[PDB]
Symmetry: C3
Subunit: 146 residues, 3 copies
């Protein structure tokens, strides 16, 4: 874990974000049960009848949050890992990771909490900035070692 | 591949799971062709007419299985890789990886096979346990190296 | 970045593909705004009224492209990273990475550009070939080190 100075901070933030995705999965399942809105007939038949194989807007919202997480957190897992080994200034690296972590936690709160626009969109954009920064830094390092 | 004692087992299980996702992709395409249920008008027009740009419940089921795989296997790819370098007891590490592998293969069989509830849900939960375990172990290691 | 001879090429292609996914995300948002097709009521109310919380076929197409990217590029990020450390012939490794990069960029152009079938399907298949190749190579290396 001490293979580079930024790596522990990266691994902490990454793992917290993976756990935060698992929390979204748990919430999704709870909403399905409470709203009786299942995706599969076999599930519905166990939980009250075929009429409960149906869509629900709160379930759909949970799925959108989880999807957006997969669109953003998964690339961070890759970029941040690589970036950690490029010898960034450790404080600058911490700032990239913390901005991503806080932005993404805020995004889920804004999404699942139905907060007014543009709160969710701002949190998304915030969190994408350090990702864009890391991606460009990796591109320069990779290109210059070809 | 021998950078740590758990790494070969991790790479074997991971790669098998990636291949298993590719199998879901292949099945999905076959179901679209057999049910004549395409997502895009350009595809439908090549395969019999515009009426075949339509949804189908078996195609939707395949997509749900693939989505659930992306929600669970992708985090395992990250967590298990990191975990392999944390000096776990090799047998304990094997058990984490094997439980995930067997649970996830069983999940796809249960999902695509339309097995009765709660078989799929149990397989999901089974497989998530080693992921939760690895995530917490990474969190402690990362935190203690800050 | 010089931990193995193939690694710089891998990191270049990977990072370009992550950026290409971000481009799909940007396009998606622009299409939502231009078509006034938002997924959430809070978004619609900010952009003209509740009637604009609605689906749109161009938005749906963008989401399909992004989903297909997550189904294919994310596994490449894992496989290609591992493969880079297995001592492949560097030119052969470059060819795997370049075929994936070109195939995936072509896939997005074909998808978002609504190009006739089977252009998108061919690009998908093209790009999957080096992934299948890397996966099998990893499987043999992992298995033989058990
Ligand atoms: C990582 C998980 C974060 C979960 C954040 C959940 C935020 C829930 O927030 C709640 O949302 C409801 C609308 O959904 C409102 O009616 C409640 O008043 C609000 O507090
Ligand atoms: C859009 C997001 C912009 C992110 C800016 O990112 C910056 O780019 C600079 C120029 O390439 C690099 O020198 C910096 O290291 C990087 O932080
Ligand atoms: C990794 C890929 C696993 C594929 C598992 C496919 C399981 C198919 O299982 C089949 O499903 C049908 C319902 O779909 C049933 O009608 C068949 O009897 C059943 O055998
Ligand atoms: C919910 C899933 C629980 C997974 C338990 O995981 C365990 O947590 C312990 C305490 O943090 C650690 O000491 C162990 O190494 C880990 O296996
Ligand atoms: C990485 C991002 C690639 C973006 C490729 C966008 C291709 C857009 O291509 C455009 O698509 C339209 C149909 O959608 C056609 O009407 C236009 O004539 C065509 O040029
Ligand atoms: C289906 C896609 C096939 C990809 C072929 O991949 C090849 O497989 C060989 C045999 O395992 C390996 O020896 C090669 O290194 C690998 O390139
Ligand atoms: N797939 C996204 C791409 C753009 C994006 O990620 N937008 C942010 C800021 S508006 C978001 O939170 N989107 C909501 C979502 O993905 O459901 C979308 O459909 O909106
Ligand atoms: N996205 C999931 C989150 C919870 C989850 O993964 N549940 C498991 C056990 S019931 C599952 O197999 N879900 C089916 C699915 O994701 O389609 C869902 O909508 O259910
Ligand atoms: N999830 C895919 C699995 C198969 C696949 O990836 N097919 C390629 C070639 S036809 C594709 O471009 N699919 C379009 C898509 O995923 O929307 C699907 O539903 O088609």
């Amino acid at each position: 874990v001490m293979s580079s100075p930024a790596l522990p901070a990266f691994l902490l933030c990454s793992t917290l974000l993976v756990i935060k995705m698992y929390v979204v999965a748990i919430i999704t399942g709870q909403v399905r049960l409470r709203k009786k809105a299942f995706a599969n007939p076999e599930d519905a038949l166990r939980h009250g009848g075929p009429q409960y194989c149906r869509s629900d807007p709160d379930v759909e919202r949970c799925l959108r949050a989880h999807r957006n997480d997969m669109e953003t957190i998964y690339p961070f897992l890759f970029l941040g890992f690589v970036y950690s080994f490029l010898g960034p200034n450790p404080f600058v690296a911490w700032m990239h990771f913390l901005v991503f972590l806080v932005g993404r936690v805020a995004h889920t709160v804004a999404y699942l909490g139905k907060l007014r626009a543009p709160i969710r969109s701002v949190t998304y954009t915030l969190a994408q900035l350090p990702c864009a920064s890391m991606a460009l830094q990796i591109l320069w390092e990779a290109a210059r070692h070809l």
